Design a protein around this ligand. Structure first.
Ligand SMILES: O=c1ccn([C@@H]2O[C@H](CO)[C@@H](O)[C@H]2O)c(=O)[nH]1
Ligand SMILES: C[As](C)(=O)[O-]
Ligand code: NI
Ligand code: NI
Length: 331
């Protein structure tokens, strides 16, 4: 109302104290074209906004196995006071690191840690984006058979799968969805052999929800499409980032096309940047669970090469998810 007892602080004497933010990466690595890459692009963009550079305010520690998680988190505790665990698999290692370093702030992406004041948890309604990918897939299949390549069987990938199946069923319940899991988010060779088998069995669209394993699914679709006419091409649905640029190829009949139908978006980078800004301002949301869904555009579908009929069905499906008229299952 009033502030009679006040003192003027000159701008020459004022500063904002900065934070140092690091990501600890899951198996996919910062070149997975999807989940970990999104996180890394977000941290780089945060670093740029704060006039920082790699290993001078921000960096990444790549994990190659589960045993690496703890070592990477402990290494990050040396110079960083905001540390991101990028992947549900990092749950336990983040819990342990947050308990040993109560003075530092920790974020878990894709799962929830309870009753830890220095931990924030971020989840995405990947069922809702998956549903839209399913509607898109059902509106473009000619063979009436589509493929789903998961990374690791889990609550997280089951949301994608359950949403995708439900979305396909909402358009045409007669469509067959072949489901196979690679058992890794960093095994490209397994992605290629699963995609090869799913296409050979009559899938004309594969949705790859497997991080870096998905590079094999792109490689398989490129090989098939290179040795075929453009009108006989087979589709891939992108994940986490808009992957349209990865679907470019030249057909057998010399035509240049794109085999990316649509991409589910998961704004991991945007979350990294937004929470890093909250941490620097001393407003770190410790103990909170942050839920991103279709409503807040934390997940979305990039429509890319979908037919106008498909786009209308997507917009109708999206509107019904926001309305509450359609409840997308999580299992
Ligand atoms: O290293 C990785 C890569 C991907 N994912 C999961 O796989 C999904 C699809 O890439 C991502 O949204 C994320 O939930 C992981 O858990 N770890
Ligand atoms: C009326 As319907 C469930 O086929 O979109
Ligand atoms: Ni006032
Ligand atoms: Ni005074």
């Amino acid at each position: 109302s009033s502030h009679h007892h006040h003192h003027h602080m000159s701008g020459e004497n004022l500063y904002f104290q900065g934070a140092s933010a690091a990501i600890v990466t899951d198996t996919g690595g910062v070149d997975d074209k999807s989940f970990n890459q999104s996180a890394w692009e977000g941290l780089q963009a945060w670093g740029k906004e704060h006039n920082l550079s790699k290993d001078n305010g921000f960096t990444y520690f790549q994990s190659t196995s589960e045993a690496d998680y703890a070592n990477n988190l402990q290494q990050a505790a040396g110079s960083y006071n905001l540390i991101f665990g990028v992947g549900f698999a990092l749950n336990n290692a983040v819990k342990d690191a947050a308990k040993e370093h109560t003075d530092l702030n920790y974020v878990l992406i894709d799962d929830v840690i309870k009753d830890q004041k220095n931990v924030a948890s971020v989840t995405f309604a990947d069922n809702e984006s998956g549903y839209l990918a399913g509607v898109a897939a059902a509106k473009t299949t000619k063979t009436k058979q589509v493929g789903f390549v998961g990374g690791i069987e889990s609550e997280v990938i089951s949301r994608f799968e359950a949403g995708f199946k439900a979305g396909v069923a909402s358009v045409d319940p007669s469509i067959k969805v072949q489901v196979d899991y690679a058992g890794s988010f960093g095994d490209a060779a397994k992605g290629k052999t699963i995609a090869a088998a799913q296409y050979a069995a009559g899938a004309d669209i594969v949705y790859q929800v497997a991080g870096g394993t998905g590079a094999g699914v792109f490689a398989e679709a490129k090989s098939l499409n290179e040795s075929r006419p453009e009108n006989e091409k087979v589709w891939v649905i992108g994940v986490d980032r808009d992957q349209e640029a990865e679907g470019k190829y030249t057909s057998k009949d010399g035509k240049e096309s794109n085999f990316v139908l649509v991409s589910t978006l998961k704004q991991v980078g945007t979350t990294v940047k937004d929470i890093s800004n909250k941490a620097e301002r001393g407003e770190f949301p410790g103990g909170q669970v942050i839920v991103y869904s279709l409503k807040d555009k934390g997940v979305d579908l990039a429509v890319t090469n979908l037919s106008e009929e498909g786009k209308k069905a997507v917009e109708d499906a999206k509107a019904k998810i926001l309305d509450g008229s359609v409840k997308v299952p999580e299992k």
